[PDB]
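immunoglobulin lambda chain variable region
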Amino acid sequence: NFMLNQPHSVSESPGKTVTISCTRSSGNIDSNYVQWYQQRPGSAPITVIYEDNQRPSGVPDRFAGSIDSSSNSASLTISGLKTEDEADYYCQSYDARNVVFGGGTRLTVLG
């Protein structure tokens, strides 16, 4: 079963852009769909990206999902950072039917 590896922490100021990466340990990142979840303390993991790059209704266009087959990774890019964006972000994919989660990246919005 492959692993998904992401950095534990990222930081940036409001209005800026951050990128959070998620590297797949074995096989190809494009073999299975990648989902991104946003989780604040007290909430369930909330889908912000599904199927690599699709946003659910209500999720602002500031959130963008991408896949880089060359680096075997998935990226979540958040532009125009707002304080509400401070949260842990988890990538997630599937090994057959089995759910695989990355370790999460905590985004700190400075100030």
